[PDB]
Amino acid sequence: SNWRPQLLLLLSMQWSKEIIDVRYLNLLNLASQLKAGKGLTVVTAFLQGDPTSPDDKKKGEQVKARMDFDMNQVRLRGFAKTLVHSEDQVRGSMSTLVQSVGLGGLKPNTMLISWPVHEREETEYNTFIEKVHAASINDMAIVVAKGIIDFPSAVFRMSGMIDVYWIVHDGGLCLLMGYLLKQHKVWRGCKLRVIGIAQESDNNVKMQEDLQKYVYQLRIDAKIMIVELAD
């Protein structure tokens, strides 16, 4: 197996020639830190417009050309594509893209998206859960970055803790992601810590032992700590 994330990014923000969106750049930075110059990441942007219009196709190529440049700046190897869709067709456009990506090539196995930007008002969220469902029904993991505006770019060298919270079932996936991040220089100065949350039935001692052995099986250097849920 030796499963590693083959990333598909889905971007659904507005594009303007006057600004560059930092949340978007920071999501590319996070992808690049996960991949450490390896693999082929697909980055797709969804652009509202007329999908038969020459003007909107020209806009989509400009946005693709910006994505190619930005991916190269952050050393994220892969491909960029801009999809044009009608306003009322965004749902089918996003779902069909996740279905159709990788035809005749390596298929992504992990979707990377950002947490919705604005607070719930009574759309941006309706898109979000659509993306979550699309990942799972297409056999993809999903990774959601929350607080991406504050995530570090390549000029930073983080130190301190990366905490993975482990619960009754889960899997080793969270742990792997932390480990991959720690391989990049941005996070290399961080210590990795696995925090197990114990139920009222589990005894803290044997949960510590189990996670210690499991982490050792994964060949990941991490400190194990057990915390009790109830109070």
């Binding site: 197996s1 030796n2 499963w3 196995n109 919705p116 719930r120 009574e122 969220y125 309706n126 979000f128 859960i129 979550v132 469902h133 990942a135 799972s136 056999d139 993809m140 993991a141 999903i142 990774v143 959601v144 970055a145 929350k146 607080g147 504050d150 995530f151 983080m158 130190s159 301190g160 803790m161 990366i162 905490d163 993975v164 919270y165 619960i167 889960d170 899997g171 080793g172 996936l173 969270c174 742990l175 792997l176 992601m177 932390g178 991040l181 996070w187 961080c190 810590r193 925090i195 949350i197 099986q217 994964l218 700590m225 915390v227 849920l229 109070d231």
Partner: protein, 68 residues
């Protein structure tokens, strides 16, 4: 109750990880049938759970990934 759980988890996360650079957590299974209320409550539960944490990554696998 779901709020009790989200609030207690927020208490733990802040107690142990308020000063951590990055926290990774499981993403719970999303709601079904696109009920507009069940969506707002899914998002709210996660916002309460992660209140005041600056950098959080939620992960949900297929369960079929073999890491080893």
């Amino acid at each position: 109750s779901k709020m009790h759980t989200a609030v207690r988890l927020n208490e733990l996360l802040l107690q142990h990880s308020a000063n951590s650079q990055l926290i990774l957590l499981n993403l719970p299974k999303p709601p079904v049938h696109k009920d507009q209320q069940a969506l707002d409550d899914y998002v709210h539960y996660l916002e309460v759970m992660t209140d005041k944490l600056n950098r959080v990554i939620f992960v949900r696998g297929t369960g079929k990934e073999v890491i080893t």
